[PDB]
Design a protein around this ligand. Structure first.
Ligand SMILES: NC(=O)OC[C@@H](O)C[C@H](NC(=O)[C@H]1NCCC[C@H]1O)C(=O)N[C@@H](Cc1c[nH]cn1)C(=O)N[C@H](C(=O)O)[C@H](O)c1c[nH]c(Cl)n1
Ligand SMILES: [K+]
Ligand SMILES: [K+]
Ligand SMILES: [Mg+2]
Ligand SMILES: [Mg+2]
Ligand SMILES: [Mg+2]
Ligand SMILES: [Mg+2]
Ligand SMILES: [Mg+2]
Ligand SMILES: [Mg+2]
Ligand SMILES: [Mg+2]
Lengths: 102, 70
RNA sequence: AAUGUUUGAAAAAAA
RNA sequence: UGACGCUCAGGUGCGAAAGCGUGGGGAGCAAACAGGAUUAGAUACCCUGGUAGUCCACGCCGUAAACGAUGUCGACUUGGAGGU
C-alpha cells in the first residue's frame, strides 16, 4: 500500500475507447434519434465514436442514400464532434465514419 | 374488354409496411404504389432508389401498381 | 448463439 | 334444550407484499442511484458500493397465479396403500 496510491492517479488518465453505433439506409427517424442520443452521450464523455453503415443485398446499388445518413450524423454532431475520418467507398459491405471528441 | 391503364416510370422515395411504396413518377407526382402479384410471387425485391414502372388508374392518380423494377 | 451470398418476373444455384 | 336450521343481495369485518402519513429504529439485505464491467448498444443480466424500504407503534391502503385457477350447507354411491 504505497505505489498503488501513486498509480491510482496514473490510472485516472482516462482511456478513450471507440464506441460503435451501426446505422442502416432504412433507419427511421425515431430510431435515428435514439442512436444519435447514444452518440451524443459518448462524445459528451470524451469517447470516440465509430459509425458504421451496413448494406444488405441490393442496397449496394443505392450507396448515396447510405451516404446521406452518414452525412446527417456529421451535421447533427458538427459542433459536438470532429470527423477523424469520413468514408469514401463501401469497404466490405460497410462505410465507417470515425468521429472524435472536441 | 377491360379499361386501359397508364404506365409511367418513377423512383421509390421510401418503402412502407407490407410492400407499399411512395414513388415519385416521371411527371413529378408522388403516388402510393403497391407491388404487383407477379413480382410478389416471383420474389422481386424493391428498395428505396429503385427505378420502377407504375401502372396508374384514371380513377385515382394517388395510387399505382409497380409491375416492373429496373 | 443480433450469426450460416445475391438473383428469380422476359425462367438459379453458391461458386 | 327442543327445529333454535341452511344460504345470504345490500351491509359489516378480516385480508400477503409493495405503497402512503406521523414518530422511532436501522445489523444484514436492497428498488432508485453512483462507480466498475460486458456489448453493436447495455438505460440490463455480472462486480463494488448504496438510499427509500425491509423492523417497531399508530393510522391509511384493500389488492395478488389472495389458486384446489374448484362458493357454502346437507344426503347418498365399489376399493387399495399411507400420514397425523
Ligand atoms: N453484452 C452483450 O451485449 O452481449 C454479450 C453477451 O451475450 C455475453 C454473454 N452474457 C451472458 O450470457 C450473461 N448471462 C447472465 C449473467 C451475465 C452474462 O454472462 C456471455 O457469453 N457471457 C459469458 C461471460 C462474458 C461476458 N462478456 C464476455 N464473456 C458467460 O460466462 N456466460 C455464462 C453462460 O452463458 O452460461 C453465464 O451467464 C455466466 C457465468 N458467470 C457470468 Cl458473469 N455469466
Ligand atoms: K338473512
Ligand atoms: K439503507
Ligand atoms: Mg352460510
Ligand atoms: Mg408491508
Ligand atoms: Mg413510515
Ligand atoms: Mg449490498
Ligand atoms: Mg447489485
Ligand atoms: Mg382480483
Ligand atoms: Mg379466481
Amino acid at each position: 500500500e504505497k505505489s498503488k496510491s501513486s498509480k491510482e492517479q496514473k490510472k485516472k488518465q482516462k482511456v478513450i475507447q471507440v464506441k460503435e453505433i451501426k446505422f442502416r439506409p432504412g433507419t427511421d427517424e425515431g430510431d435515428y434519434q435514439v442512436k444519435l442520443r447514444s452518440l451524443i452521450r459518448f462524445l459528451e464523455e470524451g469517447d470516440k465514436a465509430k459509425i458504421t453503415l451496413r448494406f444488405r443485398g441490393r442496397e449496394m446499388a443505392h450507396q448515396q442514400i447510405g451516404m446521406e445518413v452518414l452525412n446527417r450524423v456529421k451535421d447533427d454532431l458538427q459542433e459536438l464532434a470532429v470527423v477523424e475520418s469520413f468514408p469514401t467507398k463501401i469497404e466490405g459491405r460497410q462505410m465507417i465514419m470515425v468521429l472524435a471528441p472536441k | 374488354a377491360k379499361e386501359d391503364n397508364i404506365e409511367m416510370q418513377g423512383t421509390v422515395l421510401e418503402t412502407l409496411p407490407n410492400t407499399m411504396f411512395r414513388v415519385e413518377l416521371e411527371n413529378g407526382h408522388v403516388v402510393t404504389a403497391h407491388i404487383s402479384g407477379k413480382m410478389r410471387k416471383n420474389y422481386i425485391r424493391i428498395l428505396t432508389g429503385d427505378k420502377v414502372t407504375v401502372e396508374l388508374t384514371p380513377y385515382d392518380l394517388s395510387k399505382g401498381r409497380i409491375v416492373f423494377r429496373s
